[model samples]
Target: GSHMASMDPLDKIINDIKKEANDSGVTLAPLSVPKPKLEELSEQQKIILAEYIAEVGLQNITAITLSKKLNITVEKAKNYIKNSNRLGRTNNLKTIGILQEEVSSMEAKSMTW
Candidate 1:
């Protein structure tokens, strides 16, 4: 007859081990590694995202050409252009050797290139 099955054999085996270990006063501490919480591109890519310093700092591109180029939204495209000017990928306006951050609009306004 299909009687009732008992609790999980493997689980009960482990549970019995816990009880036996307690009674025997044996150290059953397992090396079970309890994983800890784990934590979750670059700015240069953002610059070239403007198309290889395609004058992102210069203010030539807008959502019009760039949005389609990157297949991004106009909102994102506009901000991309905005982000473009700040990081002094000044290689466009200034010399190619220098890479700046927190740049000012004056850099774009300047006539280095």
Candidate 2:
């Protein structure tokens, strides 16, 4: 009795959540991508996350914010950001980039002119 077969479960969940927030007074933000397991990551992936952290401090970001960046979940994003700190440290670039990306993207979407 549903079109779930044709839609992404995650997207459905997000839509539902957004609807709930609108119905209530709560504010919602973007989600983050699930972080891949350390053992599951390819060497390249590890390096990219590593470089991303080192160049962009993990502490500078929160799981919720990362989730918004990657379009996943705050819980998952937090885990990865925490794990990235286990090996190397990062700067604030990633966090800053994420903020900028969100603002700019939102602006583009909300532009009236």
Candidate 3:
């Protein structure tokens, strides 16, 4: 006497439960998080921009005007405005000793040694 129970109705109720939960907002929307993609691109862009400014001189280039010009975000533009000292601004590359200069700067400072 092996009588199979009603499986269709069983699945039907369970499926409806899932649908009801979805409709009733049982799940929650996640809050936005701090992210990348804003990092590297802006940073690299900053380098090139600062390089250009190194030639032009970082004179009178406010973030307000810069963002409008480069189409870069104001935040990034502000960094370039504020952090002018972070990049090299010498005309050393015109010389033949490329490796030495780059390495010299790259190797950081030596204090009276």
Candidate 2 stretches greater than 4 Å from native? 1-54, 90-113
Q: Indicate whether candidate 2 or candidate 3 has the larger lDDT.
A: 3
lDDT of each: 0.43, 0.49, 0.50
RMSD values for the candidates in order, in angstroms, are: 25.9, 14.6, 22.1
- Give the TM-scores of the predictions, in the order they appear: 0.31, 0.33, 0.31
| Full ranking by lDDT | 3, 2, 1
- lDDT of the structure predicted as candidate 3: 0.50
lDDT of 1 at 93: 63
Model 1: per-residue lDDT, tens digit, 1-113? 11333334353246654553212122211232222221112554455463544554545565666656656666555544443453544343645434345355435433445
Kindly provide the TM-score of model 2 when superposed on the true structure, using C-alpha atoms: 0.33
On lDDT, the candidate that comes out on top is 3
The true-versus-predicted C-alpha distance at residue 81 of model 1, in Å, is 1.9
Model 1 lDDT at residue 1: 14
What lDDT does model 2 reach? 0.49
Q: Which pairs of residues clash in candidate 3, taking residues 3 or more apart in a chain or in different chains? A: none
